[PDB]
Design a binder for this molecule. Structure first.
Ligand SMILES: Cc1nc(COc2ccc(C[C@H](NC(=O)O[C@H]3CO[C@H]4OCC[C@H]43)[C@H](O)CN(CC(C)C)S(=O)(=O)c3ccc([C@H](C)O)cc3)cc2)cs1
Lengths: 99, 99
């Protein structure tokens, strides 16, 4: 679809069998999701933005469905205030910026 | 134009008569630039990011050119890791997300 930016570009996603709301975020290289106890192996990472860094757990090859568009790749899990879909997955669903 | 997301959506902006590079950031409500001199009055404000809250200088009704497209709006100046163009200005230039 077409998403205007009057409000936060929040959409419904499906990850690890759960539905959540997440931001389609062109300013994020990678995807960061709220704390969730996903199965499988992970590696610790620290990621930074405004206000400093948070610790996250990096899971590879995770399936996420975004408004019906399936994607698979790296997700970082930790205490983010918001679920963030970054460019690693936006590219996979064919998402572009247009003006 | 149509901007794909395989790379960071960096653009040249014009503000205060000076050219800078900035990130088109749909996950940002607000536009936040790195420490720079800007003319006019400003008020102290706080903003929160992934890592916590920072002190910024809020400049209202500032002229800013984004890839030629003119915007006049609020610009926050402070210790952001990256110059980000947020939705307050992306809406002005007619930016949408599409997939
Ligand atoms: C109840 C509460 N809500 C909050 C605020 O919650 C939010 C809401 C949205 C965001 C998204 C964030 N936007 C943002 O900082 O925007 C601020 C300016 O406008 C306001 O509007 C929202 C906040 C304010 C960017 O879009 C994306 N970022 C990078 C850019 C800075 C370069 S990143 O997230 O740092 C990040 C870093 C690394 C990676 C991987 C490793 O690549 C992925 C993402 C973050 C926190 C606090 S408390």
């Amino acid at each position: 679809p077409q998403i205007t930016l009057w409000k936060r570009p929040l959409v419904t996603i499906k990850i690890g069998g759960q539905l959540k709301e997440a931001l389609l975020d062109t300013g994020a290289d990678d995807t960061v999701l709220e704390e969730m106890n996903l199965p499988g192996r992970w590696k610790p990472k620290m990621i930074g933005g405004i206000g400093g860094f948070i610790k996250v757990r990096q899971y590879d090859q995770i399936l996420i469905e975004i408004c019906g568009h399936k994607a698979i790749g790296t997700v970082l899990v930790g205490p983010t205030p918001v679920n963030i879909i970054g460019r690693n997955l936006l590219t996979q669903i064919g998402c572009t910026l247009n003006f």
